[PDB]
Design a protein around this ligand. Sequence first.
Ligand SMILES: *[C@@H]1O[C@H](CO)[C@@H](O[C@@H]2O[C@H](CO)[C@@H](O[C@@H]3O[C@H](CO[C@H]4O[C@H](CO[C@H]5O[C@H](CO)[C@@H](O)[C@H](O)[C@@H]5O[C@H]5O[C@H](CO)[C@@H](O)[C@H](O)[C@@H]5O)[C@@H](O)[C@H](O[C@H]5O[C@H](CO)[C@@H](O)[C@H](O)[C@@H]5O)[C@@H]4O)[C@@H](O)[C@H](O[C@H]4O[C@H](CO)[C@@H](O)[C@H](O)[C@@H]4O[C@H]4O[C@H](CO)[C@@H](O)[C@H](O)[C@@H]4O[C@H]4O[C@H](CO)[C@@H](O)[C@H](O)[C@@H]4O)[C@@H]3O)[C@H](O)[C@H]2NC(C)=O)[C@H](O)[C@H]1NC(C)=O
Ligand SMILES: *[C@@H]1O[C@H](CO)[C@@H](O[C@@H]2O[C@H](CO)[C@@H](O[C@@H]3O[C@H](CO[C@H]4O[C@H](CO)[C@@H](O)[C@H](O)[C@@H]4O)[C@@H](O)[C@H](O[C@H]4O[C@H](CO)[C@@H](O)[C@H](O)[C@@H]4O)[C@@H]3O)[C@H](O)[C@H]2NC(C)=O)[C@H](O)[C@H]1NC(C)=O
Ligand SMILES: *[C@@H]1O[C@H](CO)[C@@H](O[C@@H]2O[C@H](CO)[C@@H](O[C@@H]3O[C@H](CO[C@H]4O[C@H](CO)[C@@H](O)[C@H](O)[C@@H]4O)[C@@H](O)[C@H](O[C@H]4O[C@H](CO)[C@@H](O)[C@H](O)[C@@H]4O)[C@@H]3O)[C@H](O)[C@H]2NC(C)=O)[C@H](O)[C@H]1NC(C)=O
Ligand SMILES: *[C@@H]1O[C@H](CO)[C@@H](O[C@@H]2O[C@H](CO)[C@@H](O[C@@H]3O[C@H](CO[C@H]4O[C@H](CO)[C@@H](O)[C@H](O)[C@@H]4O)[C@@H](O)[C@H](O[C@H]4O[C@H](CO)[C@@H](O)[C@H](O)[C@@H]4O)[C@@H]3O)[C@H](O)[C@H]2NC(C)=O)[C@H](O)[C@H]1NC(C)=O
Ligand SMILES: *[C@@H]1O[C@H](CO)[C@@H](O[C@@H]2O[C@H](CO)[C@@H](O)[C@H](O)[C@H]2NC(C)=O)[C@H](O)[C@H]1NC(C)=O
Ligand SMILES: *[C@@H]1O[C@H](CO)[C@@H](O[C@@H]2O[C@H](CO)[C@@H](O)[C@H](O)[C@H]2NC(C)=O)[C@H](O)[C@H]1NC(C)=O
Ligand SMILES: Cc1ccc(-n2c(-c3ccccc3)nc3ccccc3c2=O)cc1
Lengths: 105, 290, 119, 60, 254, 208, 333
Amino acid sequence: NIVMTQSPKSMSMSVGERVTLSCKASEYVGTYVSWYQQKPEQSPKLLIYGASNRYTGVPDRFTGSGSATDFTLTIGSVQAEDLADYHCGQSYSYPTFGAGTKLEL
Amino acid sequence: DNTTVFTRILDRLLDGYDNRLRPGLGERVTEVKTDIFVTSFGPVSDHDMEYTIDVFFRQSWKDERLKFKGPMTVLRLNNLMASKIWTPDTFFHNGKKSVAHNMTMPNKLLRITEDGTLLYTMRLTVRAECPMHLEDFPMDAHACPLKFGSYAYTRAEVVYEWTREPARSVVVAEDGSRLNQYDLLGQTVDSGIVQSSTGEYVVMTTHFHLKRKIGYFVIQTYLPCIMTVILSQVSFWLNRESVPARTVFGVTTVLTMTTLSISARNSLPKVAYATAMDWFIAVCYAFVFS
Amino acid sequence: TIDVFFRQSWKDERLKFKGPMTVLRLNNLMASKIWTPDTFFHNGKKSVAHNMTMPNKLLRITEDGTLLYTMRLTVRAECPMHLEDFPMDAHACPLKFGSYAYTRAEVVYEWTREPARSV
Amino acid sequence: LSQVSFWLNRESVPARTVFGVTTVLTMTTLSISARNSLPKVAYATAMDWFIAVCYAFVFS
Amino acid sequence: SNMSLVKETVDRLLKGYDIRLRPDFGGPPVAVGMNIDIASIDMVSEVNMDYTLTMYFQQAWRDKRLSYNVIPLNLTLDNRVADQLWVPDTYFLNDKKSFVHGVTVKNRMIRLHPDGTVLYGLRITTTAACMMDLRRYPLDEQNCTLEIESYGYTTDDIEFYWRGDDNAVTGVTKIELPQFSIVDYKLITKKVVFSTGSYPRLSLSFKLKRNIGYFILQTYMPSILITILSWVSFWINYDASAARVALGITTVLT
Amino acid sequence: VNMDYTLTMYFQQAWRDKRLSYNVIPLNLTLDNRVADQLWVPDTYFLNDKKSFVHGVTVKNRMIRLHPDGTVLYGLRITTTAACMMDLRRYPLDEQNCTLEIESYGYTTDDIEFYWRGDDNAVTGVTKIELPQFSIVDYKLITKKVVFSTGSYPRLSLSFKLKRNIGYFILQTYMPSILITILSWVSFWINYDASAARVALGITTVLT
Amino acid sequence: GDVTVILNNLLEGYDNKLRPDIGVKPTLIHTDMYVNSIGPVNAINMEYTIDIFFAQTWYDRRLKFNSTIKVLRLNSNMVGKIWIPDTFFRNSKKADAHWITTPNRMLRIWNDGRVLYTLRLTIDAECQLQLHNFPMDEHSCPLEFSSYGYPREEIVYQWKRSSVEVGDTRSWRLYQFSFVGLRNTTEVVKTTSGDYVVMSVYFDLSRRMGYFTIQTYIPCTLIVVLSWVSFWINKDAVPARTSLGITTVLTMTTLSTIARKSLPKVSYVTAMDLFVSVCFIFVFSALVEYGTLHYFVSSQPARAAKMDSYARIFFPTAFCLFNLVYWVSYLYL
Ligand SMILES: *[C@@H]1O[C@H](CO)[C@@H](O[C@@H]2O[C@H](CO)[C@@H](O[C@@H]3O[C@H](CO[C@H]4O[C@H](CO[C@H]5O[C@H](CO)[C@@H](O)[C@H](O)[C@@H]5O[C@H]5O[C@H](CO)[C@@H](O)[C@H](O)[C@@H]5O)[C@@H](O)[C@H](O[C@H]5O[C@H](CO)[C@@H](O)[C@H](O)[C@@H]5O)[C@@H]4O)[C@@H](O)[C@H](O[C@H]4O[C@H](CO)[C@@H](O)[C@H](O)[C@@H]4O[C@H]4O[C@H](CO)[C@@H](O)[C@H](O)[C@@H]4O[C@H]4O[C@H](CO)[C@@H](O)[C@H](O)[C@@H]4O)[C@@H]3O)[C@H](O)[C@H]2NC(C)=O)[C@H](O)[C@H]1NC(C)=O
Ligand SMILES: *[C@@H]1O[C@H](CO)[C@@H](O[C@@H]2O[C@H](CO)[C@@H](O[C@@H]3O[C@H](CO[C@H]4O[C@H](CO)[C@@H](O)[C@H](O)[C@@H]4O)[C@@H](O)[C@H](O[C@H]4O[C@H](CO)[C@@H](O)[C@H](O)[C@@H]4O)[C@@H]3O)[C@H](O)[C@H]2NC(C)=O)[C@H](O)[C@H]1NC(C)=O
Ligand SMILES: *[C@@H]1O[C@H](CO)[C@@H](O[C@@H]2O[C@H](CO)[C@@H](O[C@@H]3O[C@H](CO[C@H]4O[C@H](CO)[C@@H](O)[C@H](O)[C@@H]4O)[C@@H](O)[C@H](O[C@H]4O[C@H](CO)[C@@H](O)[C@H](O)[C@@H]4O)[C@@H]3O)[C@H](O)[C@H]2NC(C)=O)[C@H](O)[C@H]1NC(C)=O
Ligand SMILES: *[C@@H]1O[C@H](CO)[C@@H](O[C@@H]2O[C@H](CO)[C@@H](O[C@@H]3O[C@H](CO[C@H]4O[C@H](CO)[C@@H](O)[C@H](O)[C@@H]4O)[C@@H](O)[C@H](O[C@H]4O[C@H](CO)[C@@H](O)[C@H](O)[C@@H]4O)[C@@H]3O)[C@H](O)[C@H]2NC(C)=O)[C@H](O)[C@H]1NC(C)=O
Ligand SMILES: *[C@@H]1O[C@H](CO)[C@@H](O[C@@H]2O[C@H](CO)[C@@H](O)[C@H](O)[C@H]2NC(C)=O)[C@H](O)[C@H]1NC(C)=O
Ligand SMILES: *[C@@H]1O[C@H](CO)[C@@H](O[C@@H]2O[C@H](CO)[C@@H](O)[C@H](O)[C@H]2NC(C)=O)[C@H](O)[C@H]1NC(C)=O
Ligand SMILES: Cc1ccc(-n2c(-c3ccccc3)nc3ccccc3c2=O)cc1
């Protein structure tokens, strides 16, 4: 399939700082990667579609970038409600998801 | 009178129908699902930096004004029904000249499902512009694009989407290769947005990756150049007491090199830089002259 | 090859009018609804009438019923050359036009100005 | 160039032979090319006569 | 008067005719029979990998709507009525550029028969793509073909077949090509599957063999003759360096 | 050889028609292009074009967009083969200036007025044009009135200044002839006792 | 005024889908042709161009009126409203009417219902040129036309007494060929559609051998005499004579390539390439003769000495003899 290597496995940052999550695609996926926020005991929520397109209801601090194999999700000035898991997936081919990334303080 | 009831269905379907207005004109964005079947990948014109392509261009959208109920679930209609309804005004951005085939009739297709979904397929040939960088010619590779989208409808009105998984939405037929000088390694698709002077438009892109075959140029330029170099160097083994013979060798080899150098470029466009073939011919000319 | 504005002018009494304008600078599609001369080029091979971005035509009706009708053409015409003195040769390339379908008892052509100033 | 050959000494045979041969070949090429530019008229033009006379001089 | 009878018959046939529906719209497929009279095969080009043929392309089908029993004659109509009747959406898949001849009028025919049989002919010139294997050129054989298919109507809407099944195509033996000889030709009936359904297809294909004599004269002979003139150098004494080198170099140049 | 260039452009026209004014709908109506056959459009033409067309796949590549005040935005994707008379006295070290003349065929200057929307940014995409043999050095927009026997007409001129790249010609014709002249000079280093050799050099050089 | 009334009455209740006398008798059409010019005849595509005025006349009892006006002289406006025969040209690769400034068409309707319908046409007509005896080749190739959908029972064409008229022939575009006459013919052909009356006009064209003379014959014979020149050069000058012969050969092959490139790629032998091949054989003979002479110098001097003089006479005599045979056989054919 297409392997989405998402790094780091986990990371912690206080409230107010900028973070950059990164996702690596095995093959070419164009701009067909989406970012998902999954808070504990909840279903995933789409944040970024395309590669840089904020889904409706997504605050303006979340923002995605990248094309081809390299992608990133920068959360500028994280708040206290940004603690969750963050999954990257590709929809270029039959979907595959990254292993995930946990965000603590 | 099954034809009569179907005629009554069709007439009730177009009553009070304004084909000037897209479905969901002021209250929704029209979503056109798109699919391409490549029946042949025409030749690549290096001189013109273009390539020809034959396709079935398939477009599907939903028109709520075209719902119907009858003894069929789909209506396979003659292609003159498409002119009576709204259809997307898709065009190829880097298209140079394309043709919508109409022998013996307009090579078109219109299926209406009873829920109002439409399938609209065309057969058409596209001459598209493929910008090429020939620094590594004749050992170069290119990604020739095919970009399409809506004319006159911005992202807020019509958006385009691949009907199936993006990686499976452009399909090339097995026997459909009209490539003489190139090899079709594969295809890639993408979607994006272009800001024009009239607004923000969705653009769908396909890249066809072509690798040039070196064989023709080997036989026609590289082997002759190596042969002339060998012949020029064979003159060393002649006796020094034969000035006319070695003079003939030198002059005729130089003349052959000049003819070959004039011949080689004639196949490529008149670019302003030196290709790999140009460097090879230059070194061969240097050896003959030396 | 020759690119021309081809101007024709005739009187049609049926097109007299009386209004605020002395002349009606009319669109190129009004001409299709009225009689126009069927001029053609006797030695023309393959001519084109331009309709980019619209038909390159012109119709102007004066109140007295005089019509002006001009069109933009590219005319390709046969010029039979006698190449005995080539390349020191001079030629007279003709351009003959007249009415298909109307004999001299029905339609005649004249130059609009002095003949020496009409081309 | 053909007339230059008259100033070479009578001993340099291959030199004068090359002059004559190459000049005639050049004239034949020059004749074909000059006929290329024209419609395939069936008569002779002024250029044809000039070429024919120059060829006659080279042959002579 | 028989003119009035024909006029009323044609008016009745064309009244209430829905061009948007094929014959037997909801019922079984309509069967279209194909005839081809090949006028010529024009330019077999290796450079463009294609060829041009002109043919009288004829199609025949039953349309019960266009049936009449008041007059005993087959009605040939002005070919403008073809724009008012349903005709099949036949297209040639591999053709690169085509037209119907239009002098002095559009060269098409439309003939009605009392039982409803329509006869619809077209004089067509198609430039059809034909990929040629030139590995054995000029001692090569080429197999080109014209692919005939329905565009909109799948195989449960329409059926294609050759009328005669072997005499459906005529005029092949009369074709003379400057460089090729027609070895033979075949007629194939099949169905092809696409993502949008399965469609009827007819294939007409020709086997073309290239003539050798032209190539012999123009390119083979000179090669042997230059090789023999190069051999002539062996009968020249080794003392004559200029002569032998001129011979060899000039042969290489030729 | 043909003294002409081919350009493809998106040609936009804007005017106001009080007849097409509406106030019940608040937004701008993008209509199916086929309605342009039912509206007045200016009779614009290109005086120097030889052959041109509007692209027609999948449909005719034209745009019609109305505004509540009545403004009409009319757009076409055109390819024109404009005549480009070139002076080749300095070929291939030559700089060429050919243009596109835009004029109203039937409407004199008291019926219609042409202007460049922007008047300096009215033309876009020029800096992104890549010609293999030339480079667009400069372009200009002009507004004129031209006088014919039938009246005086608004005219807009778009001009391009093309500088020809020379590298191709260095590779193709300049270097070979220079090298052939160097070859010619070798004759003077060969003993003047040899007639066949020196004549071979000279004749071969001339013919090359 | 009342011509409008006549026209409106003629067209009212009129069906142009039905030929006159639909179910009574065949429609008889008399055809005339005025040939403006017969264009170039390119053997590469085996086609020729022709520009004509094509006149057709027939009777339509529906177009019958009674008035002081005897003839209605009309333009193309009314052509599409009446029945027109569907005449097409059978051997035309392509054809077109003329449309500048208006359709070059004419319609005249007489009192008794006679219709005359004329239009201007340029046609690229196919004809298969048997290029044996080229460039001394004469051809008579046709222009055929018939009805597309109407068999003999429905439409019959008929040549008038003075049906085909040509113009001056001085302003035509025939360079390789000269027009020498014509003839008209009628016949019936059988097709899958039915039996059709087919009309034919044959134009007789003879090639004029003035371009090919100076393009191929003079250069080839001059190259041959240049080859002869070798027989007078001193036998000791080996490089001179070798180069003379071999250069003659390469010039011969270039000339052969061009000459054959004149015409289409036909596998049979034309008269021109037989001449070129014989010239090549002559040049090859001169070169091999010098080679053998030089070889025999080392063995036998007298042999080579007399061989030179023998060749000096046997070559030109053979060439003159071949010229006589060739021209006698081909010119008197
Ligand atoms: C695949 O798709 C292709 C592309 O769509 C398609 O090709 C198109 O086919 C159609 C139909 O077959 C063509 O339309 C016909 O064209 C005929 C003319 O053909 C010549 O000219 C056209 C261009 O037409 C211009 O010129 C004529 C006359 O000069 C005008 O009448 C046209 O309106 C048009 O003029 C406009 O454009 C000009 C600029 O060019 C402007 O200057 C001008 O002001 C106008 O704006 C060419 O394209 C043709 O070339 C093509 O075809 C030839 C065929 O041999 C090829 O060789 C060539 O390579 C090209 O392929 C050709 O040169 C028209 O005559 C015709 O219209 C008449 O007939 C129809 C049907 O009968 C009528 O409905 C119509 O009303 C017209 O009849 C009226 O006029 C005639 C005139 O004689 C009268 O006799 C008649 O009684 C009737 O009169 C009535 O109306 C009059 C007003 O019009 C009025 O005065 C009377 O009083 C009365 O009321 C028809 O339009 C179209 O051109 C083709 N396009 C192309 C690009 O090829 C192809 O077929 C498709 N294939 C398949 C298999 O489906
Ligand atoms: C130019 O090039 C074209 C393209 O290659 C050639 O066209 C081919 O012509 C051959 C000969 O007619 C075709 O071969 C035929 O295929 C049919 C389909 O076979 C399938 O179906 C049958 C049952 O329907 C199965 O038996 C089979 O396993 C396949 O699944 C066969 O039905 C034909 O007959 C075969 O079966 C019968 C009965 O068993 C035997 O008696 C026959 O001997 C034969 O075995 C036949 O095999 C081929 O399909 C064509 N190709 C294409 C792409 O259509 C032209 O021939 C070539 N030259 C010319 C001059 O045209
Ligand atoms: C040079 O440039 C000019 C202008 O750019 C071109 O003129 C256009 O020509 C096209 C084709 O002839 C015209 O389109 C035609 O419109 C006709 C009328 O449409 C109106 O009126 C009818 C009522 O009769 C209404 O139904 C309709 O809603 C419009 O309000 C139609 O008669 C034509 O229909 C034909 O095609 C349709 C396609 O669906 C079929 O349904 C019909 O059966 C018929 O076959 C056609 O739609 C267009 O209007 C012209 N423009 C203008 C401004 O008049 C020239 O054609 C061009 N010259 C060349 C050679 O290209
Ligand atoms: C490519 O080729 C084209 C065509 O040759 C060139 O286009 C020309 O461009 C120049 C300048 O851009 C144009 O010259 C301009 O003419 C205007 C109108 O002239 C009127 O006034 C003068 C007197 O001032 C009269 O003699 C004349 O008859 C007219 O009545 C001037 O207004 C322009 O400005 C001039 O005056 C102002 C006054 O403030 C000065 O500041 C300016 O510096 C200047 O002196 C200017 O003179 C010329 O008309 C264009 N040609 C055509 C045919 O229109 C392109 O420039 C060329 N290059 C490129 C890159 O395309
Ligand atoms: C219709 O188009 C007009 C002009 O293109 C739009 O008016 C513009 O609105 C934007 C957004 O507020 C402003 O930046 C411009 O100043 C306006 N221009 C003009 C000329 O008024 C209008 O908003 C569009 N209609 C809709 C519904 O968006
Ligand atoms: C054209 O055809 C007409 C009729 O088919 C030929 O005219 C006939 O000529 C012969 C003399 O050979 C007369 O006896 C007949 O009376 C003529 N018939 C008519 C109806 O006039 C005419 O010869 C043909 N033109 C040719 C062959 O050039
Ligand atoms: C078909 C074909 C293609 C190329 C060649 N050719 C070969 C050459 C190179 C390799 C093997 C045999 C000949 N050397 C040359 C040397 C100098 C000038 C031209 C050639 C040449 O044109 C001959 C025939």
